[PDB]
Each structure stands twice: as structure tokens, then as C-alpha cells.
């Protein structure tokens, strides 16, 4: 397991999708929301 | 959440205590699975007669329909297993054989009624009498009525088995029972096999009848056609001695 | 009786419900397999003399 | 333990159409 | 890739009215031209996403 | 034995309807079995409900759950 | 609202269900009543009745229904077939080679003429 | 009787079940509506359904009449109100249950839920 | 007599049986 | 860490890699029976032990007697077995 995302409400996530280059993920849930996730966060500039 | 408190408190206190008592349950050790896993992994010696159950071959192994002798042989181990020291009544084997025969006859009759038509008539000595018969088409019914009327005048006579010419003609066409008929008849109902899931699953999971033989017959998608379907009209190293070893093993098995 | 505590306890108790069976649930398989397995196990018990003899030992290097 | 017990040692038409579609 | 934030994206929503809770599944064609929904009454309905 | 959510008094009432007298042990056994069966039915019904991307338990789901368990339908 | 009807409601609520349908709990209550009646009648016919009679009646009933539930490892759920038999069937089926296809037929072929809906109008 | 003549005469044997109900349940069971499926077939299926229901009703009435004139209704068929009005025959649950038990159905219930 | 040497390959049933036996073997 | 087998295992690779090691089993074939080296009795080709001959023909590990093999400590080589066959049948 690489990492766990969080934020969606309870009830389910019927579908998922990946960007063309496999760097962004979008999920729609039964709580009436659509969310976009960043697989790899940017490197901090210190 | 606010209404949850009211819904909970609407119950009497005794019921609330009964519900709260659940926390004392000793969870789910499911230790009862131990026996299942073990199974799947002066005085009389009652364990020497139970083991005889496996000596006699099964019906499928031999091909003989079970009879009084086989059932009589099979009875005793079951009785000893359950603790019936005395045994069984003298006249139980015949009863069991009759019951088995009746069950098989009922099942086979159930399968046949849903896939056959134009059975022998009810004029006499043939047909199904007071049982449940098959359907009859218009043309066959007309011909059967005409032949039954004629036979009373003596113009025509029955065959050796008592079938009039039309009935024998119809019976000529019918072929042997197959697996497609069984599969179709199992869609309508249970056919008496409600207690034998293994048989039904074996029927369902097998190859479709007539598929292994015609393993390379295909159609094609073509919307121009009426239906969209276009019908076409070390020692002894194995890598070198494998063949010889296989041949000798095949001869050994025979 | 603190209503909030009582309702929280009731909901927590219900959330962990897990009834237990009275008799084990059966498992089905063809008769032929069971009979063949029983015969093989009996024959092996006879051949190995109840496990007191190891007929699978090897001496030398073949 | 399990792994030790098992003895595990340690042609041109395509290009034509593409060019037409690009043109 | 260093610093900054994630990418911005848009979104178009297709809504279905008067279903009355008898929809079980959904799907879009690979090129987003048709949409099909399977209902609890055992039939399937296919639309055209542009109305043609 | 364990703690039962099903009250054995319902089992007692059903037995009374049939003119049967029950001791404590058979009553407890029957109540536990009925509890287990209700649990099984609920599991199947929730399976069917979740299979259709919903969070609302209707009567069709319970009917299907009964159908898969080979129980006589309720009309 | 009768008793056990406010308790089944809470039990279902505590497991995710965010809505309901009146007369569902009524259905469950009637099902429990019918199951109890059937089991009790069978037990009475078998044998005052001991616990052995009830156990035997339930064991006999389990022979042809209630072959489901959320059983896990070697629990007779999902049909009730044994895992070894299914492994045997899978081994037998997974032996043959995958069908041979050519690019000119990758998406247009169909099964034999005997297994298609040709001429059902 | 012949199938062809019966189908042709079906114009004179249209049941009382509307067409909308027939279309709805035919589509639920997996058959397209009349415009794609001969209306005669839909009418025939509706007629068969009507015959079945009529037979059930006749059996229920026969069961009810005999009971009319110990004296306690059988357990398991809870249902009813005050007892109706006048000396009219009332379709109660006991007659329906006894009638449909012949067809393989079971309509047992509970009386006092407690 | 002729002497041969062959190799037997494993399967999924073998692993299933191994785990099943390990489940019921007291330590 | 342990060396993992290739995608396809063949007799040549296993025999070569483990050459010079004792064979896993020894089997003697006669006209109508067979036995093991230290075994004193015999097995008939028609007896329940026909499964072993079938496995030998098909080159598959006999999972049915896994516990019996484990009791005897039979050696395994990368999960496989090496079997020596003596043909007194001819």
C-alpha cells in the first residue's frame, strides 16, 4: 500500500477514473460530491 | 442525530437492558470449525462393521441399478454408526428399493413432460391412462381421431406393441434424451432435485451439449442480414526418454 | 440515566451484533470423491501399519 | 519455514490514410 | 516538479429526472456519444448525449 | 449460552398457538436459531441493496434475498 | 409501533441504511413467525420434546434451503459447494488452450449456429 | 378446437384487464409491447391470467359458504375489523388462505405482534 | 532394468492442501 | 530472500541445478504391481493407489498423500519432486 486518501463521506464510491498520464484521480461518491486527488504531491522547496 | 435519541428512548428500560447485555457475549471464536477442518484434512467392536460400507462399489462405478442386495449390504453400517445395536427390520430392503424406484420414475417423468409432444393415444393398453400426458398438435390429433374411428370398423389393425400406424410413425422420430433437454427442464422447475445441489451444479457447469464435437463452427456479425448474423454455408533423463516412459506407463495402466 | 450515554451504549452494542449458529452449516461434494478418498486412506493405513513404518525412506543416492 | 521446507535455494495503406488525415 | 499546486479541471454534469429510484447502473460510450442506464424493471434505455 | 436479541416469549407464544409446552432449553435453542436466520436474511438483503448503488432498503431487495435462500415467498 | 419493530429498525440503522420502507419490519416478523411454526411442527412430529428433537429438525431443514449467508473460510455459503471440488473443476477447465484468433476476426465472430438467436420472430 | 381459429376469434374474447397493465408486466417479464408483438398474443395471455384468478375466486367463495350457518378461526390468518355490516359475505383472509393453499401458496401471518 | 528420472511440477491444489494442513497441526 | 523459479519450469533446469542430490522417491514397476524401496508389501495397478501412477503419467505432485509424505520427511526441490523408476516389468 502506497498511501491512503480521505475526505469522502460514508456511503460508497461507485466509480473512479485516472487521468491520461496517470497523475490525477477523480472519484464520485453517493454523498453528492466530486473530488480530485493528486497522486504525487509537489516536492517542497524548503 | 437529535431524533435518534428519541427513537432510542421510546423503548422500555427492560428492552434497553436486554440490548445492552449483548456486550458480554464472547465474540466469535468460531472454534466449531475445528471439527470441519479435521474432517476435511465383554464389548463389541462397532468400528469393524462400519468400515465395510466402502467395500461395495457404487452404482455409477459398476453400472448396475441398485437392488435389494446392494441396499441390504449398505443398511448395516448406517445403523451401527447411529447406535442401533439391534439392527434393522427383516423387510426393509424391499421397501427401500421400491421407494428408490418410485423416486427415479417420478423424476424421469417430470423431465419428459416438458420437452415431448404427440404421445401414444388413450385408446387402450397404451398411453398414460389416468396420469399426466403430453400435448397434442392439431394434425396429429386429427389423424389419431380418424385412425381410432377406422379401427372400430376392422379396416386397420394395431402393431405388435398395440400402437396404431400414426402412433408408431410419431414414435419413430423421437431420439434419445440428451443434456440440452435436462438443462431446459431445470429452468422451469426443480424436477424433484431440490435436495441434491451437486447434481444441478454438475449439469449447469458442464460443456454445452454438442460443443466439443463442433468446436470450430462460427458465425459472423453482419447487419445487412435480417438478424445481423451471417451464417457460413542423472540416468534415463526425461527430456530424451519421456516418450518411452510414457508408453510403458500407458501399457501399465491399460 | 444519562440519555446520551445510554443511547450511545445501545448503538455501540447493536453495531457489533454477530449471531452464532446452533448447528454447523453443511458442505456438499460428490459421493465418488469421498468413497475414493476413504478407500485410499484405509489402504495407506494398512500399508504403513498405522504410521509405525515409513515406506517412503530412501537409502543411498540412486 | 514453509519456503525452506519446499527446497527454495538462497502496411503502406495505413501510412497513406494517416497522411491524408493529417493533410 | 517542485512547488505550486495541483492542476485545475472542469466538469460537465448530466442529470436524469423522474427516475423514481429505479436506476441501477450507468455507462458512457468510449467517445461520449451515448449513455445507457439499467433499471429495476429489467429493461435498458439508450440515449444520445447530443439529442440527434 | 449466549445473549439473545430475540425474546424467547415470542417462541413461547407460537408454541402456545400450536398447543405445545416447551422447557427452557428447547426455547433457547429455537430463539437462537430464529435470530441466526434473521441475521442471514439481513445479510443477503444488504448484499442485494449494495449491488445496485443505493442506500435505501426496499421490499424488492428482501424478496430477492428470500428467493436466493429457497424460502417460500411472502405476498 | 410493536416491540422488536423498533429494535429491528435500530439494528438496520446501525449498519448503514439511511432510509427504509414501512412494512419491511412487518415482513421480517412474519418470516420469523412462519419459520418458527414450521420448525416446531417438524420437531413435534419427530418426537414433551427434548433439545435433540429441535436439533434434528433444524439439521433436516438445512438440507434443502438456507444455503447462503456470509460464511467465510470453509463456511457453507454462496451455494454450499466445497472448495476442493471447485478447484478440481477449475483445473479441468483451465487446461485447454485459448482460442486462436486473427486480427481480421477480432470483434466480429460469434458462437456456432446452434447457440445464437437466429430466426426467433 | 384449433389454435388458428381461436386466435382469429380472439376479437370476441378480450379480457377485462387493460392494455397498459399487460404492456407493463410483459415488459417486466421480458417481452416487448404489442406494437412489436401481435396484440392477439397479449390478449391471450391476459385471458389466461383472468381464468386463473376466476378459478381462485370461485374456490374462495366455495370455502367461505360452508363455514356459514369449537367455532374459532384457525391460527395464523390474522386480519379483519369489527366484523362487517349486515349479513353480507366478506372476503376475509382465512378463506383466501385456505383456497390458495391448494395452489402451492402460503399466506400465514401473526395476529398479535407484542 | 531400465532406469528413469523424472520431475513432478506443483499446482494450486498442493498449496491449498499445505495451508489447510498447517491450519490444523498443533504446535 | 530465496532464488525464484523461472516463468516455465522444465526437467532439465531442475535436474541440472540440483544434480548430485538424493532422489526424492524410488519406484519399482513389475508386471502387475509396484512398490517403494523400503516398502515390504506391494500395490496393485487396480487398487486405490492408481492415482500415483496417473500423477506420474501426467507429471503432477500427488496432493492427496501430502500429509503421508510430510510424515516421512520426503525432500522437495523448489517445490517439485525427483522420482527414480526401475522397470522390472519388461
Q: If you write DSSP's letter for every residue of G26-74 in order, what string do you get?
A: HHHHHHHHHHHHHHHHHHHHH----HHHHHHHHHHHTTSS---S---TT
Helix (H, G, I), strand (E, B) or coil at B128: coil
Select from I3, I9, I11 the Cβ nearest to the Cβ of J84. I3
For B50, the grid coordinates are 462400519
Show the CA angle centred on residue H30, arms to residues H25 and H34, nearest 5°.
65
The CA distance from C34 to H21, in Å, is 53
SS3 of B238, please?
Answer: helix
Report the C-alpha gap between A18 and C45 in whole angstroms.
Answer: 59
With a CB cutoff of 8 Å and minimum separation 6, the contacts of J72 are C54, C55, C56, C57
Contact: chain B with chain J (3+ CB pairs below 8 Å): yes
Measure the CA–CA gap between B196 and B186, rounded to whole angstroms. 13
Max CA separation in chain B (angstroms): 93
The H or E element that residue B71 is part of is helix B68-82
- Residue C11 · residue J32 · CB < 8 Å: no
Please give the order of strands across the beta sheet that includes E34-38: E27-28, E34-38, E44-48
The whole-angstrom distance between E7's CA and the closest CA on chain F is: 30
Q: Please tell me what DSSP assigns to residue G78.
A: T
Half-sphere exposure of G105 (CA within 13 A, CB side): 10
What residues does E2 pair with on adjacent strands?
A43
Nearest C-alpha neighbor of B91 from the set B75, B107, B103: B75
The CB density around residue C34, as the number of other CB atoms within 10 Å, is: 11
Cβ–Cβ under 8 Å, residues C16 and J34: no
Residues in F touching C19 (Cβ below 8 Å): 5, 32, 35-36, 38-39
**Angle value at C-alpha C41, between C36 and C42, nearest 5 degrees:** 100
- What sign does the CA torsion over B6, B8, B11, B13 have? negative
- For residue I3, what is the DSSP state? E
Distances, alpha carbon G66 to alpha carbons B19, B133, F69, H40, H65, in Å: 26, 34, 5, 42, 39
Contact indicator for A35, A19 with CB cutoff of 8 Å = no
> Which grid coordinates belong to D9?
535455494
**Which helix (H) or strand (E) element contains residue B199?**
helix B197-205
- Cross-strand pairs, J28: J35, J86
Q: Is G91 helix (H, G, I), strand (E, B) or coil?
A: helix
φ, ψ of residue I5 to 5 degrees: the values are -135, 125
Alpha helices in chain F (DSSP H): 8-17, 24-50, 59-68
G69 vs F contacts (CB less than 8 Å): 39-40, 43-44
The length of chain J in residues reads 90
Burial (CB < 10 A; 0-12, 13-18, 19+), residue G96, is: exposed
The angle at the Cα of E9, spanning E8 to E11, to the nearest 5 degrees, equals 155
DSSP E7-49: -----------S-TT-B---EE-TTS-EEEEEBTTS-EEEEET
Residues of B in contact with F70 (CB under 8 A): 194
Helix (H, G, I), strand (E, B) or coil at B77: helix
Q: What angle do CA I9, I11, I17 make, to 5 degrees?
A: 125
Smallest CA-to-CA distance from G51 within F25, B109, C58 is with F25
Residues comprising chain B, all counted:
254
User: Is the separation of the CB atoms in G61 and F69 below 8 Å?
Assistant: no
Map grid coordinates 492542476 to a residue.
Answer: E7
Q: List the end-to-end C-alpha distance of chain J, in Å, as a whole number.
A: 47
Under DSSP, is residue B117 helix (H, G, I), strand (E, B) or coil? strand
**What is the rounded distance in angstroms from the CA atom of residue J1 to the CA atom of residue J4?**
9
Q: Resolution, in Å, please?
A: 3.2
Q: Could you tell me if G17 lies within 8 Å of chain F, comparing CB atoms?
A: yes
**Residue for grid cell 485545475:** E8
At J87 the three-state DSSP class reads strand
Tally of residues, chain G = 121
Chain G residues with beta carbon closer than 8 angstroms to that of I14: none
Q: Is G38 left (phi over 0), alpha (psi -120 to 50) or beta?
A: alpha
d(CA F33, CA C22): 6
Q: HSE on the CB side for H16, CA within 13 Å?
A: 4
In 3D space, the residue among E31, E30, E29 whose CA is nearest the CA of residue E46 turns out to be E29
Q: Are H109 and H66 in contact (CB under 8 A)?
A: no
CA pair distance J45, J34, nearest whole angstrom: 8
**Which region holds residue A35: left if phi is over 0, alpha if psi is between -120 and 50, else beta?**
beta
- CA nearest to G88 within chain I: I13
The residue written with cell numbers 455501540 in the block is C12
Q: What DSSP letter does each residue of chain H carry, written as one string? A: --HHHHHHHGGG---SS-HHHHHHHHHHHT---TTTS-HHHHHHHHHHHHHHHHHHHHHHHHHHHHH-----PPTT----SS--STT-----HHHHHHHHGGGT------S---
Cα(E29)–Cα(E47) distance, rounded to whole angstroms? 11
Read off φ and ψ for residue G90, nearest 5 degrees: -65, -40
Grid coordinates belonging to J23: 532422489
Collapsed DSSP state (helix, strand, coil) of residue A37: strand
Contact partners for chain I, using 3 or more CB pairs closer than 8 A, are B, G, J
Please give the grid coordinates belonging to residue F33.
Answer: 436459531
CA distances from B180 to B105, B184, B207, B216, C36 (A): 20, 6, 10, 20, 30
CA–CA separation, J60 vs J66, rounded Å? 12
A6 and G CB contact within 8 Å: no
Element (H, E) at B148: helix B138-152
Chains sharing 3 or more CB pairs under 8 A with chain G: A, B, C, F, H, I
Distances (CA, A) of B9 to B2, B12, I5: 12, 7, 78
The answer to whether B19 touches C14, Cβ cutoff 8 Å, is yes
Give the Cβ contact number of residue A31 at 10 Å: 12
Cα distance between residue J10 and residue J6, in whole Å: 9
In order of H17, H24, H33, H70, the CA distances from H14 in angstroms are 9, 17, 17, 46
Q: What is the DSSP letter of B147?
A: H
| Grid coordinates of B226 | 435480417
According to DSSP, the residues that pair with A28 across neighbouring strands are A15, A34
In angstroms, the CA G61 to CA G36 distance is 12
Quote the CA–CA distance of B79 and B96 in Å, as a whole number.
14
CA–CA separation, B104 and F3 (whole Å):
46
Alpha carbon of G1 to those of G9, G23, G25: distances in Å? 11, 11, 10
Per-residue cell: C4:
446520551
Choose among C56, I4, C28: nearest CA to J66.
Answer: C56
Q: CA–CA distance from C33 to each of C39, G63, G84, J48 (Å)?
A: 10, 20, 10, 12
Q: Is I1 helix (H, G, I), strand (E, B) or coil?
A: coil
Listed in sequence order, the residues at least 6 apart from G29 whose beta carbon sits closer than 8 Å to its beta carbon are: G2, G4, G5, G8, H110, H113
> Which of J44, G18, G110, B160 lies closest to A30 in space, CA to CA?
G18
On whether the CB atoms of residues H36 and H80 are closer than 8 A, the answer is no
DSSP-derived secondary structure letter, B126: S
Chains in contact with J via at least 3 Cβ–Cβ pairs below 8 Å: B, C, D, I
Output the CA torsion sign for J11, J12, J17, J21: positive
Joined together, the cell numbers standing for residue C45 give 493405513
How far is residue B218's CA from residue B200's CA, in Å, rounded to a whole number?
29
SS3 state of residue B220: strand
Q: List the Cα angle J46/J49/J52 in 5-degree steps.
A: 115
Burial class from Cβ neighbours inside 10 Å (0-12, 13-18, 19+) for residue G75 reads middle
- Is the Cβ–Cβ distance between G77 and C25 less than 8 Å? yes
Cell numbers given for B223: 447487419
Distance of CA H8 to the CA centre of its chain: 27
DSSP assignment string, J13-63 = HHHHHTTTS--SEEEEE-SSEEEESS--S-EETTSTTHHHHHHHHHTB--G
Amino acid at each position: 500500500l502506497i498511501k491512503k486518501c480521505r475526505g469522502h463521506g460514508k456511503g460508497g464510491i461507485p466509480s473512479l477514473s485516472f487521468s491520461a498520464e496517470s497523475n490525477v484521480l477523480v472519484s464520485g461518491g453517493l454523498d453528492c460530491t466530486v473530488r480530485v486527488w493528486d497522486i504525487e504531491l509537489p516536492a517542497d522547496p524548503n | 442525530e437529535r431524533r435518534l435519541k428519541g427513537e432510542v428512548m421510546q423503548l422500555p428500560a427492560r428492552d434497553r437492558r436486554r440490548i445492552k447485555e449483548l456486550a458480554h457475549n464472547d465474540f466469535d471464536p468460531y472454534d466449531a470449525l475445528a471439527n470441519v477442518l479435521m474432517e476435511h484434512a465383554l464389548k463389541m467392536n462397532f468400528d469393524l462393521e462400519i468400515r465395510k460400507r466402502y467395500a461395495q462399489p457404487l452404482a455409477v462405478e459398476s453400472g448396475e441399478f441398485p437392488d435389494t442386495s446392494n441396499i441390504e449390504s449398505r443398511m448395516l453400517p448406517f445403523c451401527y454408526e447411529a447406535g442401533l445395536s439391534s439392527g434393522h427390520a427383516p423387510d426393509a430392503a424391499q421397501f427401500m428399493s421400491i421407494a428408490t424406484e418410485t423416486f427415479i420414475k417420478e423424476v424421469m417423468s417430470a423431465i419428459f413432460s416438458r420437452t415431448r409432444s404427440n404421445g401414444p393415444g388413450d385408446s387402450g393398453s397404451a398411453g398414460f391412462g389416468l396420469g399426466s400426458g403430453w400435448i397434442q398438435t392439431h394434425r396429429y390429433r386429427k389423424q389419431l381421431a380418424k385412425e381410432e374411428e377406422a379401427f372400430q370398423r376392422g379396416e386397420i389393425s394395431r402393431d405388435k406393441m398395440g400402437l396404431l400406424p400414426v402412433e408408431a410413425k410419431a414414435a419413430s422420430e423421437r431420439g434419445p434424451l440428451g443434456m440440452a433437454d435436462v438443462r431446459l427442464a431445470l429452468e422451469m422447475g426443480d424436477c424433484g432435485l431440490a435436495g441434491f445441489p451437486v447434481i444441478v451444479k454438475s449439469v449447469i457447469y458442464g460443456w454445452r451439449e454438442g460443443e466439443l464435437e463442433n468446436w470450430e463452427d462460427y458465425t459472423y456479425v453482419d447487419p445487412s442480414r435480417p438478424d445481423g448474423i451471417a451464417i457460413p454455408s542423472w540416468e534415463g533423463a526425461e527430456p530424451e526418454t519421456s516418450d518411452l516412459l510414457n508408453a510403458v506407463l500407458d501399457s501399465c495402466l491399460a | 440515566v444519562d440519555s446520551d450515554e445510554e443511547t450511545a451504549a445501545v448503538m455501540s452494542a447493536l453495531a457489533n451484533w454477530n449471531p452464532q449458529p446452533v448447528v454447523p452449516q453443511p458442505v456438499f461434494a460428490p459421493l465418488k470423491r469421498q468413497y475414493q478418498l476413504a478407500r485410499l486412506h484405509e489402504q495407506l493405513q494398512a500399508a504403513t501399519n498405522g504410521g509405525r513404518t515409513n515406506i517412503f525412506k530412501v537409502v543411498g543416492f540412486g | 519455514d514453509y519456503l525452506k521446507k519446499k527446497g527454495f535455494t538462497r502496411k503502406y495503406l495505413k501510412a497513406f490514410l494517416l497522411l491524408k488525415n493529417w493533410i | 516538479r517542485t512547488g505550486g499546486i495541483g492542476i485545475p479541471v472542469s466538469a460537465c454534469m448530466f442529470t436524469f429526472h423522474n427516475t423514481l429510484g429505479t436506476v441501477s447502473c450507468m455507462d458512457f460510450s468510449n467517445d461520449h456519444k451515448l449513455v445507457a442506464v439499467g433499471t429495476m424493471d429489467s429493461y435498458i434505455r439508450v440515449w444520445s448525449l447530443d439529442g440527434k | 449460552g449466549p445473549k439473545l436479541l430475540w425474546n424467547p416469549e415470542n417462541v413461547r407464544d407460537v408454541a402456545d398457538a400450536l398447543g405445545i409446552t416447551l422447557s427452557e432449553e428447547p426455547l433457547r435453542l429455537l430463539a437462537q436459531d430464529v435470530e441466526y436466520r434473521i441475521g442471514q436474511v439481513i445479510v443477503e438483503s444488504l448484499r442485494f441493496m449494495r449491488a445496485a448503488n443505493r442506500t435505501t432498503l426496499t421490499v424488492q431487495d428482501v424478496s430477492l434475498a428470500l428467493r436466493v435462500l429457497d424460502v417460500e415467498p411472502l405476498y | 409501533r410493536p416491540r422488536d419493530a423498533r429494535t429491528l429498525e435500530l439494528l438496520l440503522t446501525a449498519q448503514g441504511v439511511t432510509s427504509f420502507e414501512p412494512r419491511v419490519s412487518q415482513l421480517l416478523l412474519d418470516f420469523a413467525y412462519r419459520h418458527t411454526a414450521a420448525v416446531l411442527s417438524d420437531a413435534l412430529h419427530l418426537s414433551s420434546i427434548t433439545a435433540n428433537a429441535v436439533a434434528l429438525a433444524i439439521s433436516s431443514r438445512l438440507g434443502y434451503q438456507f444455503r447462503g449467508g456470509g460464511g467465510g473460510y470453509y463456511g457453507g455459503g454462496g451455494g454450499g459447494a466445497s472448495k476442493d471440488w471447485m478447484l478440481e473443476l477449475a483445473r479441468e477447465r483451465n487446461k485447454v488452450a485459448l482460442p486462436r484468433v486473427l486480427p481480421s476476426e477480432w470483434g466480429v465472430r460469434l458462437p456456432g449456429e446452434r447457440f445464437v438467436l437466429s430466426g426467433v420472430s | 378446437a384449433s389454435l388458428r381459429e381461436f386466435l382469429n376469434k380472439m376479437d370476441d374474447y378480450a379480457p377485462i384487464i387493460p392494455d397498459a397493465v399487460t404492456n407493463y408486466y410483459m415488459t417486466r417479464a421480458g417481452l416487448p409491447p404489442p406494437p412489436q408483438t401481435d396484440i392477439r398474443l397479449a390478449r391471450l395471455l391476459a385471458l389466461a391470467t383472468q381464468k386463473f384468478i376466476a378459478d381462485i375466486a370461485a374456490d374462495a367463495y366455495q370455502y367461505s359458504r360452508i363455514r356459514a350457518s369449537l367455532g374459532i378461526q384457525r391460527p395464523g390468518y390474522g386480519g379483519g375489523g369489527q366484523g362487517g355490516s349486515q349479513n353480507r359475505t366478506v372476503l376475509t383472509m382465512e378463506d383466501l388462505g385456505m383456497a390458495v393453499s391448494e395452489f402451492g401458496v402460503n399466506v400465514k401471518r401473526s395476529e398479535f405482534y407484542r | 532394468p531400465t532406469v528413469y528420472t523424472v520431475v513432478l511440477m506443483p499446482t494450486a491444489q498442493a498449496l491449498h492442501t499445505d495451508l489447510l494442513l498447517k491450519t490444523v497441526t498443533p504446535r | 530472500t530465496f532464488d525464484a523459479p523461472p516463468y516455465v519450469i522444465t526437467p532439465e533446469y531442475i535436474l541440472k541445478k540440483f544434480a548430485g542430490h538424493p532422489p526424492s522417491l524410488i519406484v519399482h514397476l513389475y508386471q502387475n504391481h509396484f512398490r517403494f524401496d523400503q516398502q515390504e508389501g506391494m500395490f496393485q495397478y487396480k487398487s486405490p493407489m492408481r492415482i500415483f501412477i496417473e500423477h506420474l503419467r501426467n507429471r503432477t505432485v500427488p496432493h492427496e498423500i501430502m500429509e503421508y509424505l510430510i510424515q516421512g520427511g520426503v525432500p522437495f526441490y523448489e517445490g517439485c519432486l525427483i522420482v527414480q523408476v526401475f522397470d522390472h516389468r519388461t
